[PDB]
């Protein structure tokens, strides 16, 4: 078990290639089950926890919050990432990236998580009603006061990434570190330009739902899908491992991947998913999955046509 | 009689809602042909000329320059826009958005056009081999020296636009004015996010190929083929309904889309130029515009650009999910 | 009752189109009456409260301060706006926008209001004795420490708005959000350029005294006035609603209006004023009120002459 | 013998308290007439010439330029100021404060005046179609290249002045020097806040039409008409009292108002130019100045510009309301 | 008694034209006597107190500190100014404007003065061993945290003033407000350029020792001196007031004077000194004192020669 | 043989420790006289020429320019410095540090000197009528266009130097290099604080009149008169002791003071120029330098510049008062 350690984007913080998602904490998995999953994850060696204030209306944060207090040794190794943006209630200002809400949402997450500082505070989604300048200034005030260590994004598009990244740079704020996109063999549309936007900013990716909610595990059950699902099945049975470990090993080796967020619900699935770190796909199989699941946009501007138009051969010429 | 004027993006320059493309000058249209087109365009009231150094290896610029020399009255109205980026020769540096190449490309464009200042200088496409900071500095140097008035982009994607825009602000440079994208009823993918990027930066659109190279006029993988014909059928159905050209319906739709500054026409004959310019007098009804919008709507995966990802990022002003 | 929600200027915070003014709290309406008015306003759905430290020498703030503590659920929805600038005593430094006074005035309002942070802190009037740079730096320190969320202005003129707005922009401070002008059908002189100055800055308007202190309600009782009052009366009786609801519906639909500050004193007047949100004037009546109450300045520079001189026809020519 | 010199706003340039307006050159006054006026003005000791590209479609500038060519000694003393903004032609871009138009307007002004540097280049009026950032950048480019020395505004209101001023500071550009407003005993509305905006920015005033186009000299809704005549009656009463022209009283009052850099005279004959310049030797008494100030005081609504709004914003240095 | 109120330099804070110096508190005047003087000064209407941490090794601050706590009403009107720079002990770092010492000295003054914030914190003297950038950054951190309201200088020369003023401007810090120079009819050398340097920066002057330690009161007892002393005596007896009130009235009317720091030790002298505010010298007497006490430097560069060389006649010419 | 070279303040330009002043060229010394002096100076190895537009109404510059034209070899070594500020004419703007006047003063200096770039352009004196920001911007414009290399001041006091210096840093302009003060054994008041201001800004001193206009060589209120003669007596006593000129002792002292970049000689004849340049080979002893320093020490009041105010601001590195 030689750990797969990666940098939290451009920062000096290190995380394990696999991250524990707590979306099920307090929903399909109660406090007891959730406590078990955290114990197993850290027993394996992972140090990355991702939650959100809206995950069961704070029950997820509250569960994590007291597991951290009950096991202090692992608490001092864990990188905690939560989010804020979506409705913590039905009030007009119980929502968004406004200074008004983020102020209350950050204090609420800190409270329910039981921490003096949150390692990674992620905007759960773009908020067109709030100028990005306002959101960034609040985050910068939180960095200086110490409430947060770093910040990242989720549900941001290409020009979202670049605009925020460049404004923070111009205003002397800290650089953003990550983006949390829904990503897997059935959803690769972020590759059209969103990935490139992160790479330009030196940001890392925290892909969530690497199993497509279970569609890539094989259990489930419309043309492309089954061609893709069938490929994962042909390789897993060829290599003698689960479908999940295939799709997971594929996600882990994609460009700009900082850590994969697992959403496993049971100890068995967590032990199976984590076992993918020792699965080394072949370049021939990796190319096979890359092809059968390659996004097929229009030629312009993200398709083959627009890419060749923008390409510049170093030797010159058409 | 009633001309549709629009601001050149965020600047104080005004251009007619239709722009004369010159891709054919020196190729399919010789000097006399090109000069007749220019004459007809300015007799219509237009004031916007778009060319590029690579159109027929600089002959488009040379033809336009001789015409300007020969028409002092129109030349005083003309807003002249050209481009640089693609190869003017087979050398490793006859190309790119580098300081080395643009200084020579801009100078050659000025000489071929016979101008001391180009109104709108456009990067023909992104160049991942040149830092955007290097390109922007050069352009800022060209503004202060008076060689160019404004600058814009073509073949830039979402983060390209926001990055260059925000860096210009940070450096104190002038803001870019326009994006010249390939955009028509058959190709609306710049709406996934690129248009919004332009709107955030205050830039206007200079769409080109508004007729899909004759496909939206009449010259007759599964999902794409079906949409093309559903579009072609709607256009001619609305065209026959209103008793106008199919090209005029397509152009009226394009000129009515969000953020459109001027539609670049690619007419090769006086006859089709007149017809296309007649699109300005065609006011599509509410139902017609909606019918064309729905039948030609892009259909990406739900995440991130599809309906799902959109509703996720949306924030109701009243609150609640 | 479909709420009329608007943005607090350029910010990400949302407020109801109508705002409760507490000028009478502790004056014509004691703590009991004032408590009643707050209960009704929030029962209707409003979330915007405007007070000031000098409103009865803090009695207004103190009343609001304990209504907030007594009804915690509404307290967590309310956007609180107070002011500072005018004399809280007769000392030479018990007044102004100086760092010396604002420091004490902000802590005093926070104390009497019982809040950790004030949502909107408004300068009650321009202070020529204090450089705007000093005032803005203090406000920026308050934003960073969290004592305030946003800030706005009151009794500022056109070049006041632009100077402060542009200095904050150049110095990296947060942008101002609002202006609180005395505005109504009998006082539209802010339209000469003050409104345009706010629109250029993306700032919203919090008009107070939309009834002219009661002159537009019809009760009261010199040429223009009665022509204007008569117009409001001809429309209200034509539509079958009160004079107040007419003038209020007019104020709500004027350019750059974020929220109208009601100064009602009794439950009846508050219920009548708030009923104007469902009153949709006609374009013909809206034009009728716009004309009979149009400000008539000299031709130059704010009159018709100066406006046509500065106009630029997009097609060119004289 | 004793000349009244004043700084050109905040700059280190000095100009006489009276400036020769040239609106009539090439219209009511032909070349010879204009040249006599210029001669008489500089023989008086003046050094300030104000014109504009739009005065008689550039002929005012051409007349002034030929005169400067013909009077090398005076030309070395002349501070030359002109303008751009209003249409020099019927094209959509023969107008505005855009980079596109000002680059051509400034060049044409330099050519018509026969100068390599214009001392004071003025925006004739606000242009809501052009970002003030775009205009200010162009002007800053003109300062570094030496085409202009200073810049100023005309027909700007309160927030216009403060915005452009503060943005110049933020960008590191040179500060604007002057505002040229229409200002006289009959029109004092720039005192509602515009004057204060100018004082905050350190700018001086170049009032024009100081005689109300002959109304303040003698050429014979309710509240306005009454004030006009109460003013006209006071002027001639003080004029007959001191035994001087009505024009001289009006001018002496104007030149004594706050922030006044130089009063732009609009004289058409040598006789009336001499009389107007004689206003410099007229020192109105304390009572006379107060009587003129009160009878011509603006009277807006109490809020925001009236007495009420003023007392509200006032802060007693001792404290208390 | 119409108060002579002036602005604390460029700031929005106002102070009385006369300021109480506490140099004798704890030295020639014990805690009792010092308490009396503070009571009289505020009874007259003054609001300005100047002390220093080294005034009797903190005894001065400690005396003021508990008079403020014992009379809370005057405490809420008083503008408190203290200093730091000189040795609070014999340690190598018990001295200077270094971040190391000022940190401890500011906390010590706050402690002994019993205040949450000091209104005017003045550098007691230039410190060539500490870069002015270091001193200014510390002060700016103190402004933001609220420990101080404003800052000023003492024993700074012309290029000291300009360098600090312009660096703070360039770095976005707050502008300095005052300079505390030893100034009077026998010491006017700051007029050579130091005054002009303050005026360029919009800074006000807090002259201390306006009586020359008692030489201008007449009690004391070498050519210029007695000519100057004799002039003050000829005018005082001509006007029927004390010598002190003459010299004080002269100091109060000099260019750029914000407030005069009185160093009176007894109630009688304080009542006599303060009585000078109602003494209005004549322009003929003011010119008489200005001439007989005019500094006589060399022609170059501060003398008449250097001034005429640098002069520019607005009409041009030599 | 052994030349004393020193940096031109903080810059990378090198100048000989003695600089040829040209105040007399075109006045007491005609063209031939001036040309002989220049020849002798450069034959000695000097490379530093200081003039000013006001020296004989531009004739000093014209004489120097003709000489440079006639001596290509020396002209390639010459560091040429001139000035602008004082009146070149009786007009209200033939003077000052304004953009209006300096643009014309710098151009006229370049023309009279026959140069495309002046090495060191100096403000002859402070100008309280022109914002220092306006002057500094103009100078920065002249650096980028190549008209001047470096800039410096003359007749600036303590806060003048620190203010302009710090504003240049803030604006990103080039740093000023030198101050040219009147400084000699008889006039040391720039030591009260001005020298320290220069040292803080890294500027060097270009003292002029190092002989007190002949008083420190021999041409024969209470406290001042006494010091002058105590100084004159010490100089000739050290001069007779070492068997050298009185002028050489005075110059050796001046060139040995702190922050001295180059001493500007004001010689009118070849004989006295040779003698003065011989001061470079005179190395005053420790005792001699101390004796001259003490007898010529300034004596202001104790506060702020006297001994008292100095000891007050001093900080012992060990601590304690």
Author numbering:
A (entry chain C), C (entry chain C), E (entry chain C): -2 to 218, 246 to 342
B (entry chain A), D (entry chain A), F (entry chain A): -2 to 217, 242 to 342
Task: Quote the passages of the study that discuss this structure, keeping the authors' original sentences.
DepB plays a critical role in this process by reducing 3-keto-DON, an intermediate in the epimerization process, to 3-epi-DON. DepBRleg from Rhizobium leguminosarum is a member of the new aldo–keto reductase family, AKR18, and it has the unusual ability to utilize both NADH and NADPH as coenzymes, albeit with a 40-fold higher catalytic efficiency with NADPH compared to NADH. Here we present the crystal structure of DepB from Rhizobium leguminosarum (herein designated as DepBRleg).
A pair of protomers (A and C, B and D) associate together forming a dimer with an average interface area of 2362.9 Å2, stabilized by 24 hydrogen bonds and 13 salt bridges. Dimerization involves 3D domain swapping with the exchange of the α-helix of loop C which interacts with loop A on the associating protomer. These dimers interact around the crystallographic four-fold symmetry axis to form a D4 symmetric octamer, with key interactions mediated by the N-terminal β-hairpin, α3, α4, and the β4α4 loop. The absolute molecular weight of DepBRleg was determined experimentally by SEC-MALS to be 325.6 ± 12.1 kDa which is consistent with the 317.5 kDa predicted for a DepBRleg octamer. Although NADP+ was present at 400 µM during the crystallization of DepBRleg, there was no electron density corresponding to this coenzyme. Loop B in the apo-structures of DepBRleg and Polaromonas sp. AKR is disordered, but clear electron densities for this region were observed for the NADP+ binary complexes of the other structural homologs. Overall, DepBRleg’s substrate-binding pocket is slightly larger and more hydrophobic in comparison with the NADP+- cortisone bound complex of AKR6A2.
